[PDB]
């Protein structure tokens, strides 16, 4: 929810695709109630050529709440329309069986696992495809541009992190949301807080203590994502478990020091994203303008 009720958004039937034209392959990811599988779609291209796609669907374990949530995701994707910095909708199957959501396939997978795999060969300054500082600045710019677009459409992400960014051809990043297709019960980055399992280390104080999610709380998460990026995939608040001492320290103003590979101007952005006053944080549009200047000066 937040600013817009996703259940009231319309679904354009121009997206309707016949489900008998899909051939399912390997499961890319699974949670308790949902999954994402790799598939071949036939007749999606005007010229009889087959194409590889990603398909999100529910498991027989899912209930009415999860069935409403997958339909709401489809309505939001149809409402947003395509954007270069967001995973794009290609089609959907809404009759003749369970809901299927068809999105573009991203050959390099999630950004978190890519950074961890590339960590040991990082170059701060050719066939080998080494990760450089130039690539980290470009990723930070592309993610801020996609988030500036979501905010302009009155959308709040609520789970922005490196694990929710995909990487495709030509070092292009795409904002995504695995949601129900992530096993949050066995992921240590999600913590038990009341009757929920939440990503506390990425959450703004107003979201933790008041359950308030806004344009400003997404900006706090972006600052945490920057720390993950310039630490080459390390977990935030290293050596600190999520306990009473953690919630106390955050309220009292404790903040992480800069990661090892962050330029000083990128750490300056992180600090402003983590201001206790939501009105003192920059907008995603201001972040884009700031990074643009850094890239041009480089």
Ligand X SMILES: COc1cc2ncnc(Oc3ccc(NC(=O)Cn4cc(C(C)C)nn4)cc3)c2cc1OC
**Is residue 36 near ligand X by the rule CB under 6 A?**
yes
State yes or no: residue 93 binds ligand X (CB under 6 A).
Answer: no
With binding defined as CB under 6 A, does residue 22 bind ligand X?
no
Which C-beta is closer to ligand X: that of 136 or that of 150?
A: 150
Nearer to ligand X, 34 or 259 (CB): 34
DSSP string, 188-221: TTSEEETTEEE-GGG--HHHHHH----HHHHHHH
Catalytic annotation present for 275: no
Q: Which is nearer to ligand X, 90 or 250 (CB)?
A: 90
Given 12, 120, 129, 159, which residue is catalytic?
159
**Stretch near ligand X under the rule CB under 6 A, chosen from 7-15, 105-113, 258-266, 280-288:** 105-113
Name the minimum Å distance from CB 202 to ligand X.
Answer: 15
Q: Which string of x and - marks every residue 155-194 that binds ligand X (by CB under 6 A)?
A: -----------x--------xxxx----------------
Give bridge partners of residue 166 from the DSSP assignment. 110, 174
> Would you count residue 275 as binding ligand X (CB under 6 A)?
no
Residue 98: which residues within 8 A CB-CB, separation 6 or more?
57, 58
Annotated ligand binding at 171? The verdict is no
Pick 159 or 228: Cβ nearer ligand X: 159
Give the single-character DSSP code of 46: T
Six-digit token string for 263: 């330029």
Stated as kind and residue range, the H or E segment containing 168 is strand 165-168
DSSP output for 227-271: HHHHTTSPPSSTT--SSHHHHHHHHTT--PPPPTT--HHHHHHHH
Q: Which of 22, 28, 69, 131 binds ligand X (CB under 6 A)?
A: 28
**Applying CB under 6 A, which of residues 39, 69, 103, 242 lies at the interface with ligand X?**
103
90 near ligand X, judged by CB under 6 A: no
Distance of CA 297 to the CA centre of its chain: 28
Beta carbon of residue 121, minimum distance to ligand X (angstroms, whole number): 20
> Cα(185)–Cα(210) distance, rounded to whole angstroms?
23
Per CB under 6 A, contacts with ligand X among 55-74 are 56, 73
Q: Which residues pair with 175 in a beta bridge?
A: 86, 165
Q: Where are the beta strands (DSSP E) in 7-88?
A: 22-30, 34-41, 51-58
Closer CB to ligand X, residue 255 or residue 285?
285
| Residue 179: strand, helix, or coil | helix
Give the whole-angstrom CA distance, residue 16 versus residue 90: 9
Annotated binding-site residue numbers for Mg(2+)? 1, 164, 177
Catalytic residue ranges: 159
Annotated binding-site residue numbers for ATP? 29-36, 56, 104-110, 163
- Which residues make up the interface to ligand X (CB under 6 A)? 28-29, 36, 54, 56, 73, 76, 86-87, 103, 105-106, 109-110, 166, 175-178
């Amino acid at each position: 929810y937040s600013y817009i009720d996703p259940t009231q958004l319309p679904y354009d039937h121009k997206w309707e695709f016949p489900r008998n034209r899909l051939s399912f392959g390997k499961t890319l990811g699974a949670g308790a109630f949902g999954k994402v599988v790799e598939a071949t779609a036939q007749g999606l291209i005007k010229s009889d050529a087959a194409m590889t796609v990603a398909v999100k669907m529910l498991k027989p374990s899912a209930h009415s709440t999860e069935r409403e949530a997958l339909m709401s995701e489809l309505k939001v994707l149809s409402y947003l329309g395509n954007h270069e910095n967001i995973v794009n909708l290609l089609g959907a199957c809404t009759h003749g069986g369970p809901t299927l959501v068809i999105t573009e396939y991203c050959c390099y997978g999630d950004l978190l696992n890519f950074l961890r795999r590339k960590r040991d060969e990082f170059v701060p300054y050719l066939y080998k495809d080494f990760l450089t500082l130039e690539h980290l600045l470009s990723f930070s710019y592309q993610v801020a541009k996609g988030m500036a677009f979501l905010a302009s459409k009155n959308c709040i992400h609520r789970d922005l992190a490196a694990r929710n960014i995909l990487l495709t051809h030509g070092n292009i990043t795409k904002i995504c949301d695995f949601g129900l297709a992530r096993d949050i019960k066995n992921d240590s980055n999600y913590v038990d807080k009341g009757n929920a399992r939440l990503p506390v280390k990425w959450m703004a104080p107003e979201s933790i203590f008041n359950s308030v999610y806004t344009f400003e709380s997404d900006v706090w998460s972006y600052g945490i994502f920057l720390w993950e990026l310039f630490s080459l995939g390390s977990s935030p608040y290293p050596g600190m478990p999520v306990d009473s001492k953690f919630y106390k320290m955050i309220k009292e103003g404790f903040r992480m020091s800069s990661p090892e590979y962050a330029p000083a101007e990128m750490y300056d952005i992180m600090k402003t994203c983590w201001d206790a006053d939501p009105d003192k944080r920059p907008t995603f549009k201001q972040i884009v303008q700031d990074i643009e200047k850094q890239i041009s000066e480089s």
